[PDB]
mmCIF file of C-alpha atoms (C1' of nucleotides) in Angstrom:
data_model
loop_
_atom_site.group_PDB
_atom_site.id
_atom_site.type_symbol
_atom_site.label_atom_id
_atom_site.label_comp_id
_atom_site.label_asym_id
_atom_site.label_seq_id
_atom_site.Cartn_x
_atom_site.Cartn_y
_atom_site.Cartn_z
ATOM 1 C CA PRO A 1 0.000 0.000 0.000
ATOM 2 C CA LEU A 2 1.126 3.506 -0.922
ATOM 3 C CA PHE A 3 -1.770 5.490 0.605
ATOM 4 C CA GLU A 4 -2.646 5.567 4.303
ATOM 5 C CA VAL A 5 -5.945 4.102 5.512
ATOM 6 C CA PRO A 6 -7.380 6.113 8.442
ATOM 7 C CA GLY A 7 -8.615 4.774 11.742
ATOM 8 C CA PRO A 8 -12.252 4.984 12.860
ATOM 9 C CA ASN A 9 -13.281 8.432 14.191
ATOM 10 C CA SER A 10 -9.791 9.826 13.562
ATOM 11 C CA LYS A 11 -9.239 13.486 12.697
ATOM 12 C CA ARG A 12 -8.303 12.621 9.099
ATOM 13 C CA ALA A 13 -11.395 10.407 8.732
ATOM 14 C CA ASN A 14 -13.694 13.078 10.193
ATOM 15 C CA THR A 15 -12.184 15.720 7.892
ATOM 16 C CA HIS A 16 -12.821 13.457 4.882
ATOM 17 C CA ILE A 17 -16.523 12.989 5.691
ATOM 18 C CA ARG A 18 -16.931 16.758 6.132
ATOM 19 C CA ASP A 19 -15.156 17.566 2.853
ATOM 20 C CA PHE A 20 -17.067 14.894 0.905
ATOM 21 C CA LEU A 21 -20.292 16.400 2.265
ATOM 22 C CA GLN A 22 -19.012 19.808 1.128
ATOM 23 C CA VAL A 23 -18.266 18.410 -2.355
ATOM 24 C CA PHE A 24 -21.723 16.813 -2.632
ATOM 25 C CA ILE A 25 -23.502 20.026 -1.543
ATOM 26 C CA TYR A 26 -21.622 22.145 -4.125
ATOM 27 C CA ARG A 27 -22.458 19.791 -7.001
ATOM 28 C CA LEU A 28 -26.130 19.913 -5.982
ATOM 29 C CA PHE A 29 -26.000 23.694 -6.491
ATOM 30 C CA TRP A 30 -24.376 23.143 -9.903
ATOM 31 C CA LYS A 31 -27.193 20.711 -10.753
ATOM 32 C CA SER A 32 -29.899 23.213 -9.736
ATOM 33 C CA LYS A 33 -31.369 25.157 -12.664
ATOM 34 C CA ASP A 34 -33.225 27.798 -10.632
ATOM 35 C CA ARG A 35 -31.928 31.376 -10.593
ATOM 36 C CA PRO A 36 -30.873 31.973 -7.788
ATOM 37 C CA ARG A 37 -29.648 28.415 -7.172
ATOM 38 C CA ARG A 38 -31.428 26.423 -4.477
ATOM 39 C CA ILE A 39 -31.429 22.925 -2.950
ATOM 40 C CA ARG A 40 -33.452 20.952 -0.398
ATOM 41 C CA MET A 41 -32.390 19.494 2.957
ATOM 42 C CA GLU A 42 -34.306 16.312 2.011
ATOM 43 C CA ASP A 43 -31.962 15.578 -0.913
ATOM 44 C CA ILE A 44 -28.876 15.692 1.324
ATOM 45 C CA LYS A 45 -30.474 13.584 4.081
ATOM 46 C CA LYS A 46 -31.557 10.951 1.535
ATOM 47 C CA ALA A 47 -27.934 10.605 0.401
ATOM 48 C CA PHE A 48 -26.580 10.939 3.978
ATOM 49 C CA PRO A 49 -28.981 9.116 6.346
ATOM 50 C CA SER A 50 -26.270 8.677 9.017
ATOM 51 C CA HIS A 51 -25.788 12.434 9.460
ATOM 52 C CA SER A 52 -27.848 14.548 11.806
ATOM 53 C CA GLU A 53 -29.479 17.638 10.310
ATOM 54 C CA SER A 54 -27.395 19.842 12.648
ATOM 55 C CA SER A 55 -24.163 18.590 11.057
ATOM 56 C CA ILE A 56 -25.647 19.444 7.653
ATOM 57 C CA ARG A 57 -26.655 22.847 9.075
ATOM 58 C CA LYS A 58 -22.947 23.508 9.711
ATOM 59 C CA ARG A 59 -21.953 23.009 6.065
ATOM 60 C CA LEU A 60 -24.867 25.084 4.701
ATOM 61 C CA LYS A 61 -24.656 28.207 6.878
ATOM 62 C CA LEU A 62 -21.671 29.785 5.098
ATOM 63 C CA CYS A 63 -22.917 29.355 1.519
ATOM 64 C CA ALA A 64 -26.720 29.434 1.656
ATOM 65 C CA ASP A 65 -29.678 31.293 3.157
ATOM 66 C CA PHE A 66 -32.784 29.523 4.438
ATOM 67 C CA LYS A 67 -36.092 30.636 2.867
ATOM 68 C CA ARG A 68 -39.058 29.039 4.622
ATOM 69 C CA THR A 69 -42.194 28.213 2.635
ATOM 70 C CA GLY A 70 -45.633 27.097 3.797
ATOM 71 C CA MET A 71 -45.100 23.354 3.182
ATOM 72 C CA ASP A 72 -42.979 20.585 4.741
ATOM 73 C CA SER A 73 -40.429 20.986 1.924
ATOM 74 C CA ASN A 74 -38.113 24.006 2.118
ATOM 75 C CA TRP A 75 -35.199 25.430 0.144
ATOM 76 C CA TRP A 76 -31.629 26.533 0.845
ATOM 77 C CA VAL A 77 -31.058 29.488 -1.498
ATOM 78 C CA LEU A 78 -27.447 30.189 -2.495
ATOM 79 C CA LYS A 79 -26.003 33.451 -1.172
ATOM 80 C CA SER A 80 -25.726 36.172 -3.816
ATOM 81 C CA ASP A 81 -22.273 37.244 -2.572
ATOM 82 C CA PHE A 82 -20.970 33.655 -2.398
ATOM 83 C CA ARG A 83 -19.024 32.561 -5.470
ATOM 84 C CA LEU A 84 -19.751 28.879 -6.031
ATOM 85 C CA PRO A 85 -16.431 27.049 -6.579
ATOM 86 C CA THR A 86 -15.644 25.843 -10.088
ATOM 87 C CA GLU A 87 -15.359 22.194 -11.161
ATOM 88 C CA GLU A 88 -11.586 21.722 -10.894
ATOM 89 C CA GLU A 89 -11.592 23.535 -7.539
ATOM 90 C CA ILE A 90 -14.108 20.940 -6.328
ATOM 91 C CA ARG A 91 -11.784 18.276 -7.787
ATOM 92 C CA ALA A 92 -8.882 19.489 -5.625
ATOM 93 C CA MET A 93 -10.978 19.241 -2.438
ATOM 94 C CA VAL A 94 -11.458 15.442 -2.485
ATOM 95 C CA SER A 95 -9.498 12.939 -4.601
ATOM 96 C CA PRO A 96 -10.672 9.424 -5.576
ATOM 97 C CA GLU A 97 -7.813 7.905 -3.554
ATOM 98 C CA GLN A 98 -9.041 9.528 -0.320
ATOM 99 C CA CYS A 99 -12.519 8.013 -0.727
ATOM 100 C "C1'" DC B 1 -79.945 35.933 11.482
ATOM 101 C "C1'" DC B 2 -76.518 33.284 9.033
ATOM 102 C "C1'" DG B 3 -72.266 32.751 6.632
ATOM 103 C "C1'" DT B 4 -67.539 33.570 6.107
ATOM 104 C "C1'" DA B 5 -63.223 35.545 7.248
ATOM 105 C "C1'" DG B 6 -59.828 36.733 10.526
ATOM 106 C "C1'" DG B 7 -57.359 36.138 14.729
ATOM 107 C "C1'" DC B 8 -55.306 33.250 18.094
ATOM 108 C "C1'" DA B 9 -53.232 29.046 19.699
ATOM 109 C "C1'" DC B 10 -50.659 25.070 19.164
ATOM 110 C "C1'" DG B 11 -47.730 21.992 16.499
ATOM 111 C "C1'" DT B 12 -43.689 21.494 13.996
ATOM 112 C "C1'" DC B 13 -39.340 22.675 11.642
ATOM 113 C "C1'" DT B 14 -35.142 24.779 11.971
ATOM 114 C "C1'" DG B 15 -31.653 28.257 13.366
ATOM 115 C "C1'" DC B 16 -28.916 29.967 16.820
ATOM 116 C "C1'" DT B 17 -26.465 29.701 21.219
ATOM 117 C "C1'" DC B 18 -24.677 27.673 25.379
ATOM 118 C "C1'" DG B 19 -22.775 24.035 27.981
ATOM 119 C "C1'" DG B 20 -20.345 19.826 28.497
ATOM 120 C "C1'" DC B 21 -17.119 16.324 27.020
ATOM 121 C "C1'" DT B 22 -13.122 14.544 24.874
ATOM 122 C "C1'" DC B 23 -8.886 14.700 22.357
ATOM 123 C "C1'" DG B 24 -4.559 16.490 21.191
ATOM 124 C "C1'" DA B 25 -0.469 19.102 21.935
ATOM 125 C "C1'" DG B 26 3.092 20.626 24.848
ATOM 126 C "C1'" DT B 27 6.492 20.803 28.608
ATOM 127 C "C1'" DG B 28 8.493 19.409 32.829
ATOM 128 C "C1'" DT B 29 10.276 15.772 35.570
ATOM 129 C "C1'" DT B 30 12.373 11.394 36.710
ATOM 130 C "C1'" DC B 31 14.642 7.173 35.625
ATOM 131 C "C1'" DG B 32 17.765 4.362 33.105
ATOM 132 C "C1'" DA B 33 21.523 3.843 30.001
ATOM 133 C "C1'" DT B 34 26.052 4.700 28.383
ATOM 134 C "C1'" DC B 35 30.490 6.764 28.478
ATOM 135 C "C1'" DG B 36 34.669 8.108 30.569
ATOM 136 C "C1'" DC B 37 38.155 7.687 33.935
ATOM 137 C "C1'" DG B 38 40.746 5.407 37.253
ATOM 138 C "C1'" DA B 39 42.500 1.371 39.427
ATOM 139 C "C1'" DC B 40 43.907 -3.425 39.511
ATOM 140 C "C1'" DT B 41 46.100 -7.197 37.626
ATOM 141 C "C1'" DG B 42 48.682 -9.969 34.375
ATOM 142 C "C1'" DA B 43 52.577 -10.527 31.357
ATOM 143 C "C1'" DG B 44 56.968 -9.549 29.590
ATOM 144 C "C1'" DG B 45 61.481 -7.594 29.648
ATOM 145 C "C1'" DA B 46 65.475 -5.658 31.796
ATOM 146 C "C1'" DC B 47 68.793 -5.047 35.485
ATOM 147 C "C1'" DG B 48 71.270 -6.279 39.619
ATOM 148 C "C1'" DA B 49 73.008 -9.573 42.897
ATOM 149 C "C1'" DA B 50 74.569 -13.961 44.341
ATOM 150 C "C1'" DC B 51 76.358 -18.350 43.464
ATOM 151 C "C1'" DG B 52 78.990 -21.794 41.037
ATOM 152 C "C1'" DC B 53 82.404 -23.066 37.822
ATOM 153 C "C1'" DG B 54 86.863 -22.900 35.698
ATOM 154 C "C1'" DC B 55 91.557 -21.917 35.738
ATOM 155 C "C1'" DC B 56 95.861 -21.263 37.746
ATOM 156 C "C1'" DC B 57 99.045 -21.668 41.239
ATOM 157 C "C1'" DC B 58 100.946 -23.674 45.150
ATOM 158 C "C1'" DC B 59 102.058 -27.368 48.094
ATOM 159 C "C1'" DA B 60 103.419 -32.030 49.169
ATOM 160 C "C1'" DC B 61 105.865 -36.206 48.455
ATOM 161 C "C1'" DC B 62 109.373 -39.077 46.671
ATOM 162 C "C1'" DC B 63 113.620 -39.771 44.578
ATOM 163 C "C1'" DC B 64 118.505 -38.263 43.377
ATOM 164 C "C1'" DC B 65 123.161 -36.357 44.541
ATOM 165 C "C1'" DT B 66 127.763 -39.926 47.645
ATOM 166 C "C1'" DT B 67 130.445 -43.152 50.619
ATOM 167 C "C1'" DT B 68 131.555 -47.542 52.175
ATOM 168 C "C1'" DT B 69 132.259 -52.367 52.220
ATOM 169 C "C1'" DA B 70 132.513 -57.052 51.347
ATOM 170 C "C1'" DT B 71 131.932 -59.979 46.687
ATOM 171 C "C1'" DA B 72 131.554 -61.660 41.227
ATOM 172 C "C1'" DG B 73 129.895 -61.909 35.875
ATOM 173 C "C1'" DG B 74 129.797 -59.009 31.811
ATOM 174 C "C1'" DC B 75 130.991 -54.876 28.611
ATOM 175 C "C1'" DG B 76 133.937 -51.267 27.004
ATOM 176 C "C1'" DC B 77 138.236 -48.449 26.672
ATOM 177 C "C1'" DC B 78 143.591 -47.317 26.800
ATOM 178 C "C1'" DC B 79 148.031 -47.600 26.307
ATOM 179 C "C1'" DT B 80 151.818 -51.633 25.786
#
DNA sequence: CCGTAGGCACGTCTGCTCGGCTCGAGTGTTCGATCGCGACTGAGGACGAACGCGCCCCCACCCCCTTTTATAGGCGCCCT
């Protein structure tokens, strides 16, 4: 082996889960066709059932603003002053070897 | 007088904030290890002293210088 496998609940392992969540959130904004871009909490929780919503609230507070709507299905609208990172910048965040 | 709309209350979702727990990093202290120095001991070589060996000298002992005297066989020399 040439690449190090982390231990359970290590600092490297916990950083990887956070960054992979940050990668997946960003690509959901790139998939959204609405102007301004918007995503749902339900789509992240369906892909990440082992995360609490509060841990997802940490990754969404810096890049998105919560707009509540009169239905049990609400949107995270991308901040107008937040520049969404480009594709190759997302590529540098998490490599296939780290996964 | 009746119907409908609005207001309030409660439920639920989430967004923020506070408290508690745990993990990691650092620094100080204490213990063990290793290194250096000195001392002891063993081995080898060199020097000094004592003993033993070798050489030389000295001492001791025995025979040779003569005389005599009886007596006799053999060998060699000297003058008649």
